[PDB]
Design a protein around this ligand. Sequence first.
Ligand SMILES: Cc1nnc2ccc(NCCc3ccccc3)nn12
Length: 127
Amino acid sequence: SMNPPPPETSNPNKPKRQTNQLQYLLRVVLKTLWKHQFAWPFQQPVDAVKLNLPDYYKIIKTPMDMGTIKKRLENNYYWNAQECIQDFNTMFTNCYIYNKPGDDIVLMAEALEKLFLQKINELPTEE
Ligand SMILES: Cc1nnc2ccc(NCCc3ccccc3)nn12
């Protein structure tokens, strides 16, 4: 069995910025979700080999996880807040696509998504 390479976290030719909204995404959003008791399955790419999920990467074609988001935020990989918000949404959506309602992993994603939505509701206006 094999995992794909992880999503890109470094690209020198990609234009990027350090905005107040992106700072909020790291200091408030990512940090809140990262410390949560249900964050652990989402702190690194899904390891389909170790978890014995050979169909995972046959179904999930745009993988995303908080370890990748954390690296992207720390490396100032993004141009805007929308790009980062899309990464969080991809992460939750993938979990719902792959799994069944009521599964433990889905309940965990739902708890993190609730907090995500609460924090993004207060995303500051751009400076
Ligand atoms: C992320 C992600 N997206 N879909 C899946 C499917 C399984 C999975 N297993 C990780 C270990 C685990 C088992 C039970 C409950 C919580 C975590 N992680 N995962």
